[PDB]
Amino acid sequence: IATLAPEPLVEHKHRTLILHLHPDHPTLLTTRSLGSDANPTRQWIERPTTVNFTVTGEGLEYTWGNHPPKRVWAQESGEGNPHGWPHEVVVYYYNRYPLTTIIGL
Amino acid sequence: YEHTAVMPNKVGIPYKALVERPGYAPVHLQIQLVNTRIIPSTNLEYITCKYKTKVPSPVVKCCGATQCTSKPHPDYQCQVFSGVYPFMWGGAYCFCDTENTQMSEAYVERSEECSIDHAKAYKVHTGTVQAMVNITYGSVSWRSADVYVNGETPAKIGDAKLIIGPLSSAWSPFDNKVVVYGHEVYNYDFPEYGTGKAGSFGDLQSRTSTSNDLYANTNLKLQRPQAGIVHTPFTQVPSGFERWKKDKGAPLNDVAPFGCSIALEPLRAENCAVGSIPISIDIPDAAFTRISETPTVSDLECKITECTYAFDFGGIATVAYKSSKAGNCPIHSPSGVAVIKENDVTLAESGSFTFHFSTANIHPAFKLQVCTSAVTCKGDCKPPKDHIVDYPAQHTESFTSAISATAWSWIKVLVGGTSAFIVLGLIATAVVALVLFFHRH
Known part of the structure; x- marks a missing residue:
């Protein structure tokens, strides 16, 4: 035991x-x-x-x-929203893909 | 008929495919893996365990001198100590002062725990891969029998022969030398039965647990007995198998990539998820019915009522039909956007049904086929609020899954106005070249 x-x-x-x-x-x-x-x-x-x-x-x-x-397992929740003003689209894709949008911008 | 395709190498997720024999009603086929065992070919070189040095009784010829031969024994030791004059109980052992002889030989053998716990040393070599599949098609219930994962051997499950193709990856989690101690396996090198460094792993090497030939170098050195007593002392380094049990790292079943679970009795590496598996199933001709005895739909309109990003079946859509006759006929979405929870639906004359699906797209532009007729579905989805869950994803995440309609508008504004700016420079360049040419002649 x-x-x-x-x-x-x-x-x-x-x-x-x-x-x-x-x-x-x-x-x-x-x-x-x-x-x-x-x-x-x-x-x-x-x-x-x-x-x-x-x-x-x-x-x-x-x-x-x-x-x-x-x-x-981790889902795809995120923080921002993809529809809206450009200061909300950029924030949403940074919390989802943190490296791709740094070199994508 | 024969339907060949490729399935992913995942265990709990069924693979749904719709075979299409023209002139006959389609048959919904569902293939689901249960196991995936990578079984290498091993041979046992030697085992190892903690030793147990036994000491025979020394001879005391104590007026004169004695010598020994070289007995065949693993790590055998001889010495002669002169002038000991021992003292047993009831007085001294013998009269002869200051010239005596004690042998005190010693010999190393394996312990009695070597039957219970020992470490087996294996050399691996790439071998067979096999798996167990659970299958159904049409009205046939779920029947399962294990197959061989190579593109040659067919297996009869039910009345259909399935040929599971070779894996696209040659990856196996075992290095060329593994140690199997008890329940878990390791990735450790051997001294290969000839050498032993007396303190690490090959202090004691035996070809079988019941074998008679033993390799043993434990640096066994005899020592002189002191102050006139009969005992045999020695000095030697401790067992490296007991030291390996302290310093062994993490086992292979705790550091294996791709979520492999390592089992033992044929030394499997079960349930890894790497690569893809092609399939080829021959379906019997008695499972196909004529299309005149089955429903056929027309005038299909698909509306999505609720969609959720999460990889749980939270997507719902209702379509509207007008079939030729009542009955049952399957549904399937051939694209990789969404998977469908239902296999078949019950129809009537001019009704409507609903199905639950699961997608990883913000805007699912998938189409599905019902009753050999296709219809395109569109909608929008919202992210979930749960952060961590305990079930794997049902869908497959693509590259353009996360791009929304507002992000596509900003890309086309950026790409469109950049090229329109650079074309206006090219148009105005060719305009002044013509008016400068027209000035001359």
């Missing part, structure tokens, strides 16, 4: 997953991305910390403690 970690508090932002972790033993948290590059992180959590992970449209999978792994 091995210990089970407390459940994290998950909070969602635009292409960002925030995990509030409050362990009572040194606990392993490993994530990877489901794209062409894994970009893997691995760390032992001893004190109550928060970690922000960037989730793209391909996905992200995080394992915390002895829990089964969970997979999350």
Whole structure:
């Protein structure tokens, strides 16, 4: 019999997953991305910390403690609106494609 | 009939296609993968585990001297220590002072935990790829049997032979040397059974778990017993297999790209999502009905009532028809803009039905075919408010999905007025060339 970690508090932002972790033993948290590059992180959590992970449209999978792994995907919500004045069209495509509209303008 | 196409390499998303035999009613075909296992060919060179050095009882011929032969043993050690004068219980061992002999030999062997936990060293080589497909067509229910992913071998599922084509990528997540310890596999190099650096991985190498030949170099050095007691001391470096268990990095099933899940018993790398898979299915001729016994629609008008950007089935559209007769006939959208949730619809004489779809476009300009008749649908969509969800996308994001009508207006204003500015310079250049020529003659 091995210990089970407390459940994290998950909070969602635009292409960002925030995990509030409050362990009572040194606990392993490993994530990877489901794209062409894994970009893997691995760390032992001893004190109550928060970690922000960037989730793209391909996905992200995080394992915390002895829990089964969970997979999350990010939608295309954005911040601006595409229809309207030119100070709103430029802002909307910058939050969606941050590099393409920099060299596209 | 025979229908050949190409499907994406994704597991939970069905591939819907509408076969078109002219003169017969179309048959809705649905192919859905369940597994995708990349199975390389491995051979086991050697295993490794923690050692256990056993010490035989030393001889004490303690008036004179003794010598040893070279017994065949892994990391065998001999020494002779002169003038020890030991002290057992009940007085000293022998009378002869200041000239004695103790051998104290030693020998290294594998432990009894080597049957339970050990690390297997494999060399891989590219092998078969196979998958399990769930299929249906027409009125036939879902029947599934696994196929081989190569463009040669046909498999009979139901009454239809499916030939799953080769994968477009030769990517496999295993390097040429892997270590399988317990539940997870690694990507680690071997010393290849000849060498062992005594502290890293090949301190103890054995070809099989029950094998009789052992390789062992643990730097076993004997030491002189002190102060007149009978015991055999030694010094040696610790086991590198116990050190490898501390320093091993992340396993291959935690750093694999494309979301591969690594299983063990044939050493699969299951459910990767890379490339595309061509298909070729031969459909029986008894699944086609004549077109005189099926509905045929005309006067189709498509209106989209609600559309949402999200990759959940939030798109709804209702169309209006007037069929020739009542019955069932399938629907399908052949373009890559939107996928359709429904397979078939029930018709009447001059009614209307609704279907749910899913698109990644702001303005979906897709068309769909119902009852071998096409109709174009158009509309506008709004972004969703949820930021992170736990299901994959049903659609496919294109390059021009995110461009709206106002962004197309600003591009055409920019492109149109730039070329109109530069043509007016070319027109006015050719105008003054004519009036300068007309001045002379």
